[PDB]
Paper text:
Aminoacyl-tRNA synthetases (AARSs), a family of essential protein synthesis enzymes, are attractive targets for drug development. Here we present five unusual crystal structures showing that threonyl-tRNA synthetase (ThrRS) is covalently inhibited by a natural product, obafluorin (OB). OB contains a β-lactone ring with a 2,3-dihydroxybenzamidyl moiety attached to the α position and a 4-nitrobenzyl moiety attached to the β position. When ThrRS catalyzes tRNA aminoacylation, the Zn2+ ion recognizes and binds l-threonine, assisting in the l-threonine activation reaction.
We hypothesized that if Tyr462 was mutated to a lysine residue, the mutant protein ThrRS_Y462K should also be covalently inhibited by OB, because these two residues have similar side chain lengths and lysine has stronger nucleophilicity. OB increased the Tm of ThrRS_WT by 34.8 °C, which was 2.7 °C more than that of 36j. Interestingly, OB also increased the Tm of ThrRS_Y462K by 36.8 °C, suggesting that OB forms a covalent bond with the engineered Lys462. To visualize the covalent bond, we determined the 1.9 Å structure of ThrRS_Y462K in the presence of OB. The overall structure of the ThrRS_Y462K mutant was very similar to that of the wild-type protein. As predicted, Lys462 also induced the ring-opening and covalent bond formation of the β-lactone. At the same time, coordination bonds were formed between the o-diphenol group and the Zn2+ ion, and stacking interactions were maintained between the nitrobenzene group and ThrRS Tyr313 and Arg363 residues.
Residue numbers in the entry:
A (entry chain A), B (entry chain A): 242 to 640
């Protein structure tokens, strides 16, 4: 249960000192990463999130208008061009406000939910880097919700449902929720904080979450919620964050016309469910110990001949499974079938299809699982339907 | 036919001086961009391209090992960290060789086709920037093929087929192909160039392409092919490039074990079909004048009520179309139906579904196109099937 060893064994990714803290994703690791994005996109569709893409660097003058910039200016990579200085973005939020500021908005556009899979970079001390857990370049399942004060409770509800629904998909059902105190120095009126804290407290009560208040001081932007999942080793991983912001929309001049035809500043809700997805893949690799569920497995099925007489059949099957949307590989190598099955079992391929002489003549295929279970000779279409159901439902367990 | 005006009208993207040459993609522009990636991914699947992801910056020491670095060092953004200097990648190729250099390879791994949608940045003079056509950050449909000398002809054939097949999808069928001369200063033996030029010439003859030899000097890496499409205004756009490389794999220490058990340097083939995809969207926006084909349209269907009596029906329909994989929006605003239809026609929505009292009671829906064609009342499932066929086939024209 070391994602760096499993990552190497399954050829998921690598790192080198020429680019510290930045992942080289190999084909199979990138497959897992794209599948996670597909999964995230399907869950946001339910809430009608927009999906946007912001630029990788912006003028330092823009970043200086955010606020508590001094505290983070040390962690950003900077660059320059034509006597102008840029920061590689360490966060997507100011870019999202730029998109919100294009076009007059009014109350009828809110809540405006805007998600991005945007790569961000931070200049972390090299001594703290570790595998996929602590990186310099990361992509989170990021989004920002622009809403009114009244809409906070409903919007925080949606985030809560999204956290519990996405975590359970992977088998994470023990979840701890920590609310945050209000620090000495904050932006915003006391009244505005008091109402927002009421929204958060009401939203957690309706869902019956047992929350604690965290001992350390919270942010200056607004109240904050952090979600911690526990893996099968009962290890704690803080992944989800919901952060209210009364500061950034005002600093970057976001506004909308309200019902009273009066110009107002939207509330921003920053939130991420998985957090850094490089890290979440690290957690998953260890949670499953490399036995990825079928929908996540880089290679879902391997089809093998016993002799060269079945090679044309195996290629036919492979094309058929591939056209049915299954990540499938043919293994036509000159190796004994017991050698091939063992090799692909060690590489954690969910299903293994064996094609001898009986199967070419019958139109069927012999099915073995990576756990060693012998499922017998099955019709090709039966196998396809069963595989498609396991994939579309993102089932955690096999047939 | 100005993509910057159409881009603004349809709310596809914007740019600002805080990040010159770098696109802020809005929801609808990003939808087009992701659809293009889906399309590219489906065409590469046919050739079993891998898809990888490399880091955004690498040590300047690595970039200096490439060769003709002096010529391009002026165009890269540089940054630094812990008394070490990095270049924001202006190209994906050295990152792909790093991935190839992880793991011993042999002849049985070749050809190894490795694609990436990787964002790259170049420090272009601000005076040359223009819309989506000349940017500082761009993503091309990039790939690198590692192969043997013998495999060049077959590999170049695949690229040729991919160029003609992808361009025709968008309606581009007039294509001009230019081969390149051999410059005075080149890397590689004369013999190695002579054989590779024979591979390229044979590959073009088999496909019956009329090629010209370009007047200007070619690259020093190897022979080169450029493909130029013509749009409906008969404007020439050079998009595809196939560039042989005998230099980079040797400089960055790529090798494989051959059949004779002898260590050898692979040939690299750099290729892109669409080129910069920001630019290709610009070309498409002008080619279609904003009337995107259904599969590309940011919003494929809009469903409208006439009064509040049909709102529940419209929401039901919307959820049904959405579950069927159609990008669909309900328009329940308090506006006359003729006003709503005109508005969504001006925004180039392919299909418009009108729900009055007759349609709620009949279970049908009235269909109007963005060209003004009245298709009559249709069963909901008929509409879904027709829409799914137009989408899955990426048809250029409506029903
Ligand atoms: C304030 O913005 C706070 N943001 C978050 O905690 C946050 C959580 C989930 C999603 C998004 O988009 C969020 O912004 C804070 O700014 C986060 C932050 C910490 C450190 C640095 N840094 O460069 O050292 C930047 C941002
Ligand atoms: C040599 O590599 C040549 N490459 C290409 O033309 C190319 C075409 C299609 C796909 C890929 O991946 C390619 O590399 C050349 O290096 C391209 C290049 C031009 C200019 C700069 N620059 O930073 O000024 C970098 C690379
Ligand atoms: Zn944020
Ligand atoms: Zn290249």
């Amino acid at each position: 249960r070391d994602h760096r060893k499993i990552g190497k064994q399954l050829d998921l990714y690598h790192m080198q000192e020429e680019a510290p803290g930045m992942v080289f994703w190999h084909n199979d690791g990138w497959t897992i990463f794209r599948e996670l994005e597909v999964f995230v996109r399907s869950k946001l569709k339910e809430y009608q999130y927009q999906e946007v893409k912001g630029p990788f660097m912006m003028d330092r003058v823009l970043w200086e208008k955010t606020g508590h910039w001094d505290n983070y200016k040390d962690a950003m990579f900077t660059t320059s061009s034509e006597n102008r200085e840029y920061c590689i973005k360490p966060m997507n939020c100011p870019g999202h406000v730029q998109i919100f500021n294009q076009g007059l908005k009014s109350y009828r556009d809110l809540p405006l939910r805007m998600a991005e899979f945007g790569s961000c970079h931070r200049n972390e001390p090299s001594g703290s880097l570790h595998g996929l857990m602590r990186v310099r370049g990361f992509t989170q399942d990021d989004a920002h919700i622009f809403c009114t004060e009244e809409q906070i409770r409903d919007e925080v509800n949606g985030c809560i449902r999204l956290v519990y629904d996405m975590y359970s998909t992977f088998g994470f059902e023990k979840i701890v929720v920590k609310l945050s105190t209000r620090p000495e120095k904050r932006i915003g009126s006391d009244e505005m904080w008091d109402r927002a804290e009421a929204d958060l407290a009401v939203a957690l009560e309706e869902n019956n979450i047992p929350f604690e208040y965290q001992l350390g001081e919270g942010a200056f932007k607004g109240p904050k919620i952090e979600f911690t999942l526990y893996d099968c080793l009962d290890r704690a991983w803080q992944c989800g964050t919901v952060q209210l912001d009364f500061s950034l929309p005002s600093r970057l001049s976001a506004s909308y016309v309200g019902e009273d035809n009066e110009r107002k500043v939207p509330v921003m809700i920053h939130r991420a469910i998985l957090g850094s997805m490089e890290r979440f893949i690290g957690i998953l690799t260890e949670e499953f110990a490399g036995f990825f569920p079928t929908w996540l497995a880089p290679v879902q099925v391997v089809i093998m001949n016993i002799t060269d007489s079945q090679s044309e059949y195996v290629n036919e099957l492979t094309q058929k499974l591939s056209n049915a949307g299954i990540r499938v590989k043919a293994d036509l190598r000159n190796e004994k079938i017991g050698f091939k099955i063992r090799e692909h079992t060690l590489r954690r391929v969910p299903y293994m299809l064996v094609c001898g002489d009986k199967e070419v003549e019958s139109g069927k295929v012999a099915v073995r699982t990576r756990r060693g279970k012998d499922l017998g000779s099955m019709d090709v279409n039966e196998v396809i339907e069963k595989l498609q159901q396991e994939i579309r439902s993102r089932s955690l367990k096999q047939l």
